[PDB]
Amino acid sequence: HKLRDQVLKALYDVLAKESEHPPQSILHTAKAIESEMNKVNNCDTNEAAYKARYRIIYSNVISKNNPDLKHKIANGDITPEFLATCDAKDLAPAPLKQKIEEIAKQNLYNAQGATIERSVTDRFTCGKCKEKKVSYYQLQTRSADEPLTTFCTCEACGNRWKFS
Amino acid sequence: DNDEKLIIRCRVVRPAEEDHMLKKIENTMLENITLRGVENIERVVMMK
Amino acid sequence: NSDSYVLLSVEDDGSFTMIPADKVYKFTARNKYATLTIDEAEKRMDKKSGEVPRWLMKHLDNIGTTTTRYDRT
Amino acid sequence: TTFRFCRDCNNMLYPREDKENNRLLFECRTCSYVEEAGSPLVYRHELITNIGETAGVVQDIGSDPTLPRSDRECPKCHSRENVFFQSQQRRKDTSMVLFFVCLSCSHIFTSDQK
Ligand SMILES: [Zn+2]
Ligand SMILES: [Zn+2]
Ligand SMILES: [Zn+2]
Numbered sequence: 049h050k051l052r053d054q055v056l057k058a059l060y061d062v063l064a065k066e067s068e069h070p071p072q073s074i075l076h077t078a079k080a081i082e083s084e085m086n087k088v089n090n091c092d093t094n095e096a097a098y099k100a101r102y103r104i105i106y107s108n109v110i111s112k113n114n115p116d117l118k119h120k121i122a123n124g125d126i127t128p129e130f131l132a133t134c135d136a137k138d139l140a141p142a143p144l145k146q147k148i149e150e151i152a153k154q155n156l157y158n159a160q161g162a163t164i165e166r167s168v169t170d171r172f173t174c175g176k177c178k179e180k181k182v183s184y185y186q187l188q189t190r191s192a193d194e195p196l197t198t199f200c201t202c203e204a205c206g207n208r209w210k211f212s
Numbered sequence: 213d214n215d216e217k218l219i220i221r222c223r224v225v226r227p228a229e230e231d232h233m234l235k236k237i238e239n240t241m242l243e244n245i246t247l248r249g250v251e252n253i254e255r256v257v258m259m260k
Numbered sequence: 261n262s263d264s265y266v267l268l269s270v271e272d273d274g275s276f277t278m279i280p281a282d283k284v285y286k287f288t289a290r291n292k293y294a295t296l297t298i299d300e301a302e303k304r305m306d307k308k309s310g311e312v313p314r315w316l317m318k319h320l321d322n323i324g325t326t327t328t329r330y331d332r333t
Numbered sequence: 334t335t336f337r338f339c340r341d342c343n344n345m346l347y348p349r350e351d352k353e354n355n356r357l358l359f360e361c362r363t364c365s366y367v368e369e370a371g372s373p374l375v376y377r378h379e380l381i382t383n384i385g386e387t388a389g390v391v392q393d394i395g396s397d398p399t400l401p402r403s404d405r406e407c408p409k410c411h412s413r414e415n416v417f418f419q420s421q422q423r424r425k426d427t428s429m430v431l432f433f434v435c436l437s438c439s440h441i442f443t444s445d446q447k
Contacts, residue, residue, distance in 0.1 A: 161259060163259070292364075314349055
């Protein structure tokens with residue numbers, strides 16, 4: 049019964065330590081035994097993941113920022129809900145939440161790569177689709193006896209060609 | 213996870229001569245421990 | 261710079277004799293702190309230890325090997 | 334993070350721990366001088382830095398004629414003369430932020446507004 053006494057003592061401590069005092073100490077130990085008996089419903093002290101969820105909820109309570117989690121957990125937000133929530137990112141607090149969304153947006157942008165854009169004109173005509181959406185580009189390849197190559201590519205379909 | 217500064221605290225446990233051992237062990241854990249993925253693969257990007 | 265220097269040493273009456281300098285020598289202290297030995301120094305230099313002990317000199321001094329000149333005297 | 338030296342003999346101090354009183358005592362490996370440590374910080378690797386775009390300033394940067402000249406003012410002395418020049422650090426990802434140094438207020442100021 050080591051875990052089912054230790055977590056109960058943990059909730060004894062983290063509810064007595066609140067500015068929200070326990071004169072309804074019997075209500076609060078009812079809350080604690082409800083919390084622990086839904087907490088075991090994932091594991092029943094038979095799975096190694098038992099301590100992880102406990103650490104999540106425990107350090108969320110003892111976080112401060114925020115302390116208002118104590119008030120909302122004593123005035124509602126029932127404990128069998130908060131095994132199945134797994135809302136650790138979602139709670140305690142919201143400024144950190146919007147920080148996380150900004151971070152995720154930044155990462156999702158920065159994982160995108162190179163997108164060289166291939167300026168087009170209507171001067172030539174494609175070979176596959178015969179459209180004047182030529183992704184043209186110019187550069188020199190051969191020896192000194194000639195000017196540039198007149199490289200060609202169609203952007204409407206992907207058709208690369210060359211002019212003489 | 214939710215703390216403002218993510219921290220790791222570790223110690224050597226055994227039932228003088230600390231600094232260079234701990235520095236080498238630090239260097240080892242930085243250089244060797246894989247996290248996920250498959251090694252010999254590097255940065256990856258998405259084209260549309 | 262041993263050539264360009266010249267000496268203004270006051271005498272008891274206030275006289276200033278010009279002594280043209282010849283050479284300048286620099287002195288440092290040595291073996292004030294129980295210096296070590298070249299052979300065991302080579303064994304510490306070699307890769308017998310990935311890092312030598314920080315207080316290895318203190319351990320050698322506690323052993324008493326190669327003590328100070330003042331201590332030997 | 335600095336490397337203190339023994340004041341009796343200018344030598345690199347090393348950290349070594351008290352056996353029972355549980356305090357870092359910087360004992361000289363040359364002489365017997367010892368000193369307690371202000372902080373438990375010893376070593377620091379710092380695998381990421383972003384530093385070096387600013388310094389290298391002499392008191393007469395503007396004495397060289399090769400630097401360009403502008404008309405933005407120093408926001409302490411309001412004199413319209415100035416000397417501007419880019420970062421002194423050169424990596425492949427250093428910024429096009431600019432550094433503005435004046436002669437009147439003799440002060441360094443930038444053009445970033447984030
Ligand atoms: Zn085409
Ligand atoms: Zn010393
Ligand atoms: Zn100014």
